[PDB]
Structures are given as C-alpha cells and as structure tokens.
C-alpha cells in the first residue's frame, strides 16, 4: 500500500489569495527558487522573470477550468530568449531514500492560455519534473506530456531504489522546471504528491 510523503505547501495553497489579490511574485512558501543560470533577478516585477502563486478560479482568464487542486497554482515565468537556461522551484523533503521502494511523484502541469487584455499566452516553454536524492536527479520527465492551451494535465515520475543504491538515506527532493523551450514562456504546476510503496527488486 502506497504511503503519502509529506511535502510543504504541496498544492501552493499558501498564501491564501482572493479574486482581488490574485497573485504573488515571490517564491511560494516552503519552496526554494531554482535558478542555476541566473535568469531570475534580485528585483522582480510581474514582467521580469519570476515565480509565485496564482489564484486560479473558475473564471480565470488563463484556463478553461479552475485549479486542479484548491484555489491556487504555482507559476514559473522566464522573460529571457528561448534557450537562455532553465529555472523553477525545488524543495528538500524530510523523507529519505529507502531500498526496495517505488516512488511515484505526480504533478499537474498547466499550459496557461487565451488572450487577456489583448495579450496572448499562446505557446508553451515546456516542463521538466525531477525526483532527487541528495543533489542527484534520480528520475525525470521532460515534455513527455502534451498540454493544450488553457489546460492542466498530470505527469508521473517513478523511481525504484534497489538495495545497492548509492543514495540510500539521502533526503528526497523535488524540482519543477521551466526549460524555456518556447514562448509564451510561462508554465504552471499544482497538486504535487509523492508516494512510497514496497517494490519487488
């Protein structure tokens, strides 16, 4: 039986937002900004490279339906040209890597779309989801899922750790990445879940 591994602010429901105050431009609570190529400036604005939380309700400009989970989704927007680097959000968990364990990391990916006040969100930068142990990427999915404009779709990253793994006992981690492989170059995430179950191995 698959056991849920606790994640901080896993559905980006913090902070609480309203139809009136419907976004932040700050790293979601419980998450760290991942910016290996320095695309996110020290001084952010809503038009600079940024990440944050967006109230995604039933009358969202950007989606046909409300948030897959709760009220809010996370977003990662990059202003730089295609191919300039990758950036996103990451979180180190308290849980550690166990042998003969199958890990299932599920995340909803959002392709924000439509036109709002005459501006198009048509196009998509792609996505990458990574499961880590320590600072090793154990498993990853980059763009295997196609997401239509104004839709959210669920991707799944799986990994089995064997008794011979070099990473046993190292802290699990998660990264949610915008790889900047298209414009418009915003991608959203919601409802991060991670389970562990016994595996034959």
CB of 194 to a second copy, least distance (A): 15
Within 59-150, strands assigned E span 72-77, 87-96, 101-111, 115-116, 119-120, 128-133, 136-142
Three-point CA angle 139, 201, 197, nearest 5° = 65
**Which does residue 77 touch among Ca ion, a second copy, ligand BOG, none (CB within 5 to 8 A, set by kind)?**
ligand BOG
Q: Which of 4, 15, 148, 169 forms a contact with a second copy (CB under 8 A)?
A: 148
Query: Segment near Ca ion (CB under 5 A), from 9-17, 25-33, 126-134, 156-164?
Result: 9-17
143 is written with which tokens? 């763009």
Does 75 interact with ligand BOG (rule: CB under 6 A)?
A: yes
Does 162 interact with a second copy (rule: CB under 8 A)?
A: yes
Burial class for 80, CB neighbours closer than 10 Å (0-12, 13-18, 19+): middle
**Which does residue 70 touch among ligand BOG, a second copy, Ca ion, none (CB within 5 to 8 A, set by kind)?**
Ca ion
CB of 101 to a second copy, least distance (A): 11
Three-point CA angle 124, 115, 86, nearest 5° = 25
Q: Which of 146, 169, 197, 198 forms a contact with a second copy (CB under 8 A)?
A: 146
Count the site residues for ligand BOG by CB under 6 A: 11
Query: Segment near a second copy (CB under 8 A), from 20-28, 68-76, 89-97, 133-141?
Result: 133-141
Does 136 interact with a second copy (rule: CB under 8 A)?
A: yes
Does 84 interact with a second copy (rule: CB under 8 A)?
A: no
Residues 126-185 close enough to bind Ca ion by CB under 5 A: none
What percent helix, strand, coil does the chain show, rounded to 5? Answer: 0, 45, 55
Rg, the chain, Cα only: 17
- Tell me which residue of 146, 139, 144 sits closest to 175, measured CA to CA: 139
Q: How far apart are CA 108 and CA 154, in angstroms?
A: 4
Does 183 interact with a second copy (rule: CB under 8 A)?
A: yes
Neighbours of 169 (CB within 10 A): 11
What is the binding site for a second copy (CB under 8 A)?
82-83, 102, 122-124, 126, 128, 136-146, 148-149, 157-160, 162, 164-167, 181-183, 199, 201
């Amino acid at each position: 039986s698959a056991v849920s591994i606790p994640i901080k602010n896993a559905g980006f429901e913090e902070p609480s937002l309203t139809v009136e105050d419907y976004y932040t431009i700050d790293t979601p609570p419980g998450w760290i900004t991942y910016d290996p190529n320095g695309l996110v400036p020290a001084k952010r604005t809503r038009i600079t490279s940024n990440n944050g939380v967006g109230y995604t309700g039933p009358n969202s400009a950007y989606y046909n339906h409300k948030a897959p989970e709760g009220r809010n989704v996370a977003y990662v927007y990059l202003a730089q040209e295609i191919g300039s680097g990758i950036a996103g959000l990451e979180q180190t968990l308290d849980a550690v890597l166990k042998p003969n364990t199958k890990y299932t990391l599920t995340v909803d990916i959002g392709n924000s779309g439509g036109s709002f006040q005459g501006f198009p969100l048509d196009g998509f930068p792609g996505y990458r989801v990574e499961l880590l142990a320590g600072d090793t990427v154990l498993a990853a999915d980059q763009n295997n899922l196609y997401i239509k404009e104004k839709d959210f779709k669920t991707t799944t990253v799986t990994f089995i750790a064997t008794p011979e793994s070099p990473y046993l006992g190292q802290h699990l981690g998660i990264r949610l990445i915008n790889p900047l492989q298209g414009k418009f170059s915003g991608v959203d995430f919601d409802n991060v879940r991670l389970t562990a179950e016994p595996a034959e191995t």
